[PDB]
Amino acid sequence: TYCVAMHLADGLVFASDSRTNAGIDHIATFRKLFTFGTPGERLLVVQTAGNLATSQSVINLLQQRIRRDGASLLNVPSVYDATALVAETTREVMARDSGNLAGNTDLSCSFMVGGQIAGGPPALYSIYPQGNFIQATPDTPFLQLGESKYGKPILDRNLTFDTPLEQALRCALVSFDSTIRSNLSVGMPLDLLVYHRDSLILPEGYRVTEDDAYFSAIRRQWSAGLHDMLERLPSPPSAYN
Amino acid sequence: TYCVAMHLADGLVFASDSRTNAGIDHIATFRKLFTFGTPGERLLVVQTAGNLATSQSVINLLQQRIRRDGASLLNVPSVYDATALVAETTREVMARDSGNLAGNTDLSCSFMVGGQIAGGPPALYSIYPQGNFIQATPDTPFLQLGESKYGKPILDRNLTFDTPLEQALRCALVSFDSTIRSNLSVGMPLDLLVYHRDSLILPEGYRVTEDDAYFSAIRRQWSAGLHDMLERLPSPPSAYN
Amino acid sequence: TYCVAMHLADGLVFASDSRTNAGIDHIATFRKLFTFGTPGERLLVVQTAGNLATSQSVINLLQQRIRRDGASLLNVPSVYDATALVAETTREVMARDSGNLAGNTDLSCSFMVGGQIAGGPPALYSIYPQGNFIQATPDTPFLQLGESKYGKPILDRNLTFDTPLEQALRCALVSFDSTIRSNLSVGMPLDLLVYHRDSLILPEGYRVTEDDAYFSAIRRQWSAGLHDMLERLPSPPSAYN
Amino acid sequence: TYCVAMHLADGLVFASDSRTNAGIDHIATFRKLFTFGTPGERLLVVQTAGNLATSQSVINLLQQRIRRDGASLLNVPSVYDATALVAETTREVMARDSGNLAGNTDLSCSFMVGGQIAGGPPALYSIYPQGNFIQATPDTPFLQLGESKYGKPILDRNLTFDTPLEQALRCALVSFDSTIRSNLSVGMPLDLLVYHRDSLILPEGYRVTEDDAYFSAIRRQWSAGLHDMLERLPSPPSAYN
């Protein structure tokens, strides 16, 4: 479980893995990036991390309620209020499943909610286990969920509010490369989605499998590059021994 | 997180850092100085300190509500009432996020609200974690938020109601210099804003980065100065050993 | 005294004369169209007809109270509530000036209140002498105050919800043309204001004087037109004598 | 925080310190003596003690309302009614700030209100935390707020209704001397005001700083005096051991 989302000058970029702890000795693939919207009016993306049961219930309820007269991700007036609604829904799910039977088992999960609603700029939020959330800004334009320390440095080094989408995406992919190599809880397939500021369309998004020609290639290149750079760095002086 | 605001004879000066505790192992840059107003009618500045999620929500709601028929920072009749509105909004945010899920986590934050509305003098208030507030006066013309003990002495020593703006700003910068050296929770970039009494314009404000020529220079000078004065102070008499 | 307001698909159009009965042998010019608002958040227009003293007092109190912590035209959450507030204020003024000293003199006046507040469509109301009101709709998209029968037919004939603003304004002007010719209590200068749906700006509005090139011209063309049509109408048959 | 006020045959004398508890680790200077009036018609003085936020709000509202059609310190018909108005205002402030958010924090404060309105004698009242008040009389011609036990004896010993103003003031200063030495919560600068019975002018008042020549001198003299008297008092008889 590792998710990243970026809010940049030109729009939004989302990327999630799929490897999921579904119980003991049951590791499995589950999508962690979901889209919602009406074309020409709004796009919203929700990413998930943490307890599967909880996050599934949350997503499921959001879907059921879309087709119902009352508060829903399709009528909510701002990306803020969408984020709040997700949080609200999370609280509701935690209330029900909590009891003596759950015991000390940890039901918490976290989300990212981003997108654009007609008539206001695109936005991106991250909801914490405890249900309070923060918004990405130009000074802090990307947010992560899950197992994210491994792939943070490359984003810290290169990403800024002005990074174009194609390059941000690329950057995200390298982030996943390092993460996958160094932590087995993270794993392919990946799910990506790129959204263009003010387009107000629902992009289809894309799934990166094991076999993906492009992702295989940039991994091979990135390795060769790192290995090169390392050999062509100077040796430590006398002093260092 | 360290913010300072001054209300002086000639106007207002505001300065904030940007380093922000956004969770465990996630320290990040977030603007802590926000401006609002209509040119020729009003300027209001809000500074933030404390819990990111809470303060962000508060600022976000104040922005959404500006573009809405009802109480807002643009229609409020006095700087006092602006301060009250911020506080009012804070209460509202605390009410919603509070629950079993937050648990013992500390959601409190503090604010400064200052500026000028057409037809009355400029004013500056500070709102405490508990939602009650105080007003800066000629006898107590500056107020601080956050991690402020480190840089308080220089202000206590030099600042008064009659200090001109350029000098007050300079003074503030030295305050930040000492603070940054002695406490890692405070950090650049800094955000400044100077407002001239009765101008009723929205100044663009200015951001001080790591690279800033002027700020680098006065830090280097101030160090040299202190080091000099210290060596040229006399030795303690016989008595002291 | 003659005022017209229209609520159309593309926005609002307001127009008022200025000739005012201010006592015996004291006929005078007074503005009867007043604007209020905060740019990017709301526009409200109030038009007046009836007793000068009363309407002036009403408008004056609304202005004073704008700059005061409490109910005011700037904080009121809807155009409806604005209208209600105006009415509320009117009642308050009538209560105070009523007494034995006024005697049988007629202190009543009427108002139109229209505009747009952020987050809801534009609206237009008319308040009657007795303080109860009605709202213009697509089927009845214009409302009049004062001496309005003279210029009603041209509006009834041509104006509809879908009439564009430039044409509605033109239509209003022809309404004033006929009125001014046929009733001395109505008189120039006129005051106009056009507001574009969802613009949320405060238009400067425009004053039509005696000298106005455009208004002089359309009056001259309209006359010539009417005179033509009249001569080219057929004669009544034998039967009619 | 220590304030004294005296109502004497020749007029009124007011004196306040300025040291103020404004939060934890934030002790600061705030004026605690405020004047109001119209020359040739009235003088009113308000002194404050207790919670800063509360008292500031009270004073602030009294100022705002002076410039507004309704009950205010400038139109109120007697010093009594002025006192009542201050109390009334205090209640209003306590009502608003009270809630769950304040919690158990202590928002109370106390005031003195004294002065003279044309056509009646000067008067002096003290308002208690609970909003009920008492009036100084010839038999009890001074009243204190704040930390007042330290400097009470010198007033009890020497002050009476017939004490002239210059001597009463002097007496007050000695009161502050002892208080300042024995309690750190009280501190300079001090603010004084002397008002002459029937003068109906607004005296400018005077601020006593750390550096004040006269106050430094009488402190030095008073010390020397006390030390002298003490050494020249007789020894206790045999009996006492």
PDB file of all heavy atoms in Angstrom, chain C residues 100-120:
ATOM      1  N   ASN C 100     -49.400  63.094  16.588  1.00  0.00           N
ATOM      2  CA  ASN C 100     -50.426  64.132  16.301  1.00  0.00           C
ATOM      3  C   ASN C 100     -49.907  65.200  15.331  1.00  0.00           C
ATOM      4  O   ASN C 100     -50.675  65.747  14.535  1.00  0.00           O
ATOM      5  CB  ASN C 100     -50.922  64.844  17.569  1.00  0.00           C
ATOM      6  CG  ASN C 100     -51.284  63.885  18.678  1.00  0.00           C
ATOM      7  OD1 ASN C 100     -50.482  63.038  19.061  1.00  0.00           O
ATOM      8  ND2 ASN C 100     -52.479  64.032  19.227  1.00  0.00           N
ATOM      9  N   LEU C 101     -48.602  65.480  15.410  1.00  0.00           N
ATOM     10  CA  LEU C 101     -47.959  66.556  14.643  1.00  0.00           C
ATOM     11  C   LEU C 101     -47.976  66.299  13.130  1.00  0.00           C
ATOM     12  O   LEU C 101     -48.249  67.222  12.359  1.00  0.00           O
ATOM     13  CB  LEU C 101     -46.518  66.794  15.139  1.00  0.00           C
ATOM     14  CG  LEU C 101     -45.784  67.995  14.519  1.00  0.00           C
ATOM     15  CD1 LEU C 101     -46.390  69.319  14.961  1.00  0.00           C
ATOM     16  CD2 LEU C 101     -44.286  67.982  14.800  1.00  0.00           C
ATOM     17  N   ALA C 102     -47.685  65.067  12.709  1.00  0.00           N
ATOM     18  CA  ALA C 102     -47.843  64.693  11.300  1.00  0.00           C
ATOM     19  C   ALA C 102     -49.303  64.894  10.854  1.00  0.00           C
ATOM     20  O   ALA C 102     -49.552  65.454   9.786  1.00  0.00           O
ATOM     21  CB  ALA C 102     -47.383  63.262  11.058  1.00  0.00           C
ATOM     22  N   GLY C 103     -50.260  64.492  11.695  1.00  0.00           N
ATOM     23  CA  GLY C 103     -51.689  64.680  11.404  1.00  0.00           C
ATOM     24  C   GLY C 103     -52.166  63.718  10.328  1.00  0.00           C
ATOM     25  O   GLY C 103     -51.979  62.514  10.459  1.00  0.00           O
ATOM     26  N   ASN C 104     -52.778  64.248   9.264  1.00  0.00           N
ATOM     27  CA  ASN C 104     -53.279  63.426   8.143  1.00  0.00           C
ATOM     28  C   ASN C 104     -52.335  63.343   6.951  1.00  0.00           C
ATOM     29  O   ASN C 104     -52.665  62.694   5.961  1.00  0.00           O
ATOM     30  CB  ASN C 104     -54.634  63.942   7.636  1.00  0.00           C
ATOM     31  CG  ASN C 104     -55.623  64.175   8.755  1.00  0.00           C
ATOM     32  OD1 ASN C 104     -55.655  63.435   9.740  1.00  0.00           O
ATOM     33  ND2 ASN C 104     -56.432  65.213   8.620  1.00  0.00           N
ATOM     34  N   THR C 105     -51.192  64.021   7.028  1.00  0.00           N
ATOM     35  CA  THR C 105     -50.184  63.965   5.961  1.00  0.00           C
ATOM     36  C   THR C 105     -49.708  62.512   5.676  1.00  0.00           C
ATOM     37  O   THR C 105     -49.564  61.698   6.589  1.00  0.00           O
ATOM     38  CB  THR C 105     -49.000  64.922   6.265  1.00  0.00           C
ATOM     39  OG1 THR C 105     -48.120  64.966   5.138  1.00  0.00           O
ATOM     40  CG2 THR C 105     -48.220  64.492   7.513  1.00  0.00           C
ATOM     41  N   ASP C 106     -49.477  62.199   4.403  1.00  0.00           N
ATOM     42  CA  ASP C 106     -49.268  60.809   3.960  1.00  0.00           C
ATOM     43  C   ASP C 106     -47.792  60.399   3.842  1.00  0.00           C
ATOM     44  O   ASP C 106     -47.125  60.693   2.845  1.00  0.00           O
ATOM     45  CB  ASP C 106     -49.970  60.597   2.618  1.00  0.00           C
ATOM     46  CG  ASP C 106     -49.805  59.182   2.087  1.00  0.00           C
ATOM     47  OD1 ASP C 106     -49.662  58.224   2.887  1.00  0.00           O
ATOM     48  OD2 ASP C 106     -49.822  59.033   0.845  1.00  0.00           O
ATOM     49  N   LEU C 107     -47.306  59.675   4.846  1.00  0.00           N
ATOM     50  CA  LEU C 107     -45.872  59.367   4.969  1.00  0.00           C
ATOM     51  C   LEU C 107     -45.409  58.086   4.287  1.00  0.00           C
ATOM     52  O   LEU C 107     -44.297  57.649   4.520  1.00  0.00           O
ATOM     53  CB  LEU C 107     -45.492  59.246   6.452  1.00  0.00           C
ATOM     54  CG  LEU C 107     -45.762  60.446   7.341  1.00  0.00           C
ATOM     55  CD1 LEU C 107     -45.263  60.154   8.743  1.00  0.00           C
ATOM     56  CD2 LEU C 107     -45.130  61.719   6.773  1.00  0.00           C
ATOM     57  N   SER C 108     -46.246  57.484   3.457  1.00  0.00           N
ATOM     58  CA  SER C 108     -45.940  56.160   2.956  1.00  0.00           C
ATOM     59  C   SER C 108     -44.981  56.232   1.784  1.00  0.00           C
ATOM     60  O   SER C 108     -44.959  57.219   1.050  1.00  0.00           O
ATOM     61  CB  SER C 108     -47.216  55.441   2.536  1.00  0.00           C
ATOM     62  OG  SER C 108     -47.931  56.238   1.609  1.00  0.00           O
ATOM     63  N   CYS C 109     -44.200  55.171   1.607  1.00  0.00           N
ATOM     64  CA  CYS C 109     -43.406  55.020   0.399  1.00  0.00           C
ATOM     65  C   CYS C 109     -43.167  53.561   0.076  1.00  0.00           C
ATOM     66  O   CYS C 109     -43.374  52.667   0.895  1.00  0.00           O
ATOM     67  CB  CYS C 109     -42.064  55.747   0.519  1.00  0.00           C
ATOM     68  SG  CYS C 109     -41.102  55.147   1.896  1.00  0.00           S
ATOM     69  N   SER C 110     -42.713  53.357  -1.148  1.00  0.00           N
ATOM     70  CA  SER C 110     -42.513  52.043  -1.728  1.00  0.00           C
ATOM     71  C   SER C 110     -41.102  51.928  -2.298  1.00  0.00           C
ATOM     72  O   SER C 110     -40.419  52.933  -2.495  1.00  0.00           O
ATOM     73  CB  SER C 110     -43.534  51.828  -2.813  1.00  0.00           C
ATOM     74  OG  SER C 110     -43.781  53.061  -3.457  1.00  0.00           O
ATOM     75  N   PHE C 111     -40.642  50.695  -2.454  1.00  0.00           N
ATOM     76  CA  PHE C 111     -39.269  50.432  -2.794  1.00  0.00           C
ATOM     77  C   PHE C 111     -39.168  49.272  -3.758  1.00  0.00           C
ATOM     78  O   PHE C 111     -40.026  48.410  -3.756  1.00  0.00           O
ATOM     79  CB  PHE C 111     -38.515  50.015  -1.549  1.00  0.00           C
ATOM     80  CG  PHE C 111     -38.418  51.079  -0.490  1.00  0.00           C
ATOM     81  CD1 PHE C 111     -39.352  51.154   0.513  1.00  0.00           C
ATOM     82  CD2 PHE C 111     -37.351  51.960  -0.474  1.00  0.00           C
ATOM     83  CE1 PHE C 111     -39.246  52.104   1.492  1.00  0.00           C
ATOM     84  CE2 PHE C 111     -37.233  52.916   0.513  1.00  0.00           C
ATOM     85  CZ  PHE C 111     -38.185  52.993   1.480  1.00  0.00           C
ATOM     86  N   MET C 112     -38.084  49.218  -4.531  1.00  0.00           N
ATOM     87  CA  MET C 112     -37.670  47.949  -5.175  1.00  0.00           C
ATOM     88  C   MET C 112     -36.326  47.591  -4.674  1.00  0.00           C
ATOM     89  O   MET C 112     -35.485  48.460  -4.418  1.00  0.00           O
ATOM     90  CB  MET C 112     -37.668  47.956  -6.688  1.00  0.00           C
ATOM     91  CG  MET C 112     -39.083  48.334  -7.057  1.00  0.00           C
ATOM     92  SD  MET C 112     -39.497  47.833  -8.889  1.00  0.00           S
ATOM     93  CE  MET C 112     -39.000  49.558  -9.682  1.00  0.00           C
ATOM     94  N   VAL C 113     -36.139  46.304  -4.455  1.00  0.00           N
ATOM     95  CA  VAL C 113     -34.881  45.792  -3.964  1.00  0.00           C
ATOM     96  C   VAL C 113     -34.514  44.641  -4.855  1.00  0.00           C
ATOM     97  O   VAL C 113     -35.268  43.682  -4.979  1.00  0.00           O
ATOM     98  CB  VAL C 113     -35.015  45.251  -2.543  1.00  0.00           C
ATOM     99  CG1 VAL C 113     -33.686  44.688  -2.079  1.00  0.00           C
ATOM    100  CG2 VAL C 113     -35.481  46.350  -1.610  1.00  0.00           C
ATOM    101  N   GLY C 114     -33.362  44.737  -5.495  1.00  0.00           N
ATOM    102  CA  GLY C 114     -32.921  43.671  -6.391  1.00  0.00           C
ATOM    103  C   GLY C 114     -31.434  43.524  -6.350  1.00  0.00           C
ATOM    104  O   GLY C 114     -30.720  44.438  -5.923  1.00  0.00           O
ATOM    105  N   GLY C 115     -30.948  42.416  -6.861  1.00  0.00           N
ATOM    106  CA  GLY C 115     -29.509  42.213  -6.925  1.00  0.00           C
ATOM    107  C   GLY C 115     -29.142  40.765  -6.880  1.00  0.00           C
ATOM    108  O   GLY C 115     -29.960  39.904  -7.239  1.00  0.00           O
ATOM    109  N   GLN C 116     -27.915  40.488  -6.472  1.00  0.00           N
ATOM    110  CA  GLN C 116     -27.427  39.112  -6.399  1.00  0.00           C
ATOM    111  C   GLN C 116     -26.425  38.962  -5.295  1.00  0.00           C
ATOM    112  O   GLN C 116     -25.505  39.757  -5.163  1.00  0.00           O
ATOM    113  CB  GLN C 116     -26.777  38.685  -7.704  1.00  0.00           C
ATOM    114  CG  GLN C 116     -26.330  37.247  -7.683  1.00  0.00           C
ATOM    115  CD  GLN C 116     -26.004  36.712  -9.058  1.00  0.00           C
ATOM    116  OE1 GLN C 116     -25.488  37.429  -9.926  1.00  0.00           O
ATOM    117  NE2 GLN C 116     -26.241  35.427  -9.253  1.00  0.00           N
ATOM    118  N   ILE C 117     -26.588  37.907  -4.524  1.00  0.00           N
ATOM    119  CA  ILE C 117     -25.631  37.550  -3.511  1.00  0.00           C
ATOM    120  C   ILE C 117     -24.961  36.237  -3.901  1.00  0.00           C
ATOM    121  O   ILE C 117     -25.604  35.331  -4.446  1.00  0.00           O
ATOM    122  CB  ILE C 117     -26.350  37.397  -2.198  1.00  0.00           C
ATOM    123  CG1 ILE C 117     -26.744  38.772  -1.688  1.00  0.00           C
ATOM    124  CG2 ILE C 117     -25.476  36.672  -1.197  1.00  0.00           C
ATOM    125  CD1 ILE C 117     -27.670  38.733  -0.486  1.00  0.00           C
ATOM    126  N   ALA C 118     -23.654  36.156  -3.678  1.00  0.00           N
ATOM    127  CA  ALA C 118     -22.855  34.985  -4.085  1.00  0.00           C
ATOM    128  C   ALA C 118     -23.523  33.702  -3.674  1.00  0.00           C
ATOM    129  O   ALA C 118     -23.912  33.559  -2.531  1.00  0.00           O
ATOM    130  CB  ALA C 118     -21.499  35.045  -3.446  1.00  0.00           C
ATOM    131  N   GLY C 119     -23.675  32.782  -4.627  1.00  0.00           N
ATOM    132  CA  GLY C 119     -24.178  31.449  -4.342  1.00  0.00           C
ATOM    133  C   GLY C 119     -25.646  31.269  -4.581  1.00  0.00           C
ATOM    134  O   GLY C 119     -26.190  30.227  -4.327  1.00  0.00           O
ATOM    135  N   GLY C 120     -26.310  32.288  -5.084  1.00  0.00           N
ATOM    136  CA  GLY C 120     -27.697  32.134  -5.496  1.00  0.00           C
ATOM    137  C   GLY C 120     -27.992  33.052  -6.661  1.00  0.00           C
ATOM    138  O   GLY C 120     -27.299  34.047  -6.862  1.00  0.00           O
TER     139      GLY C 120
END
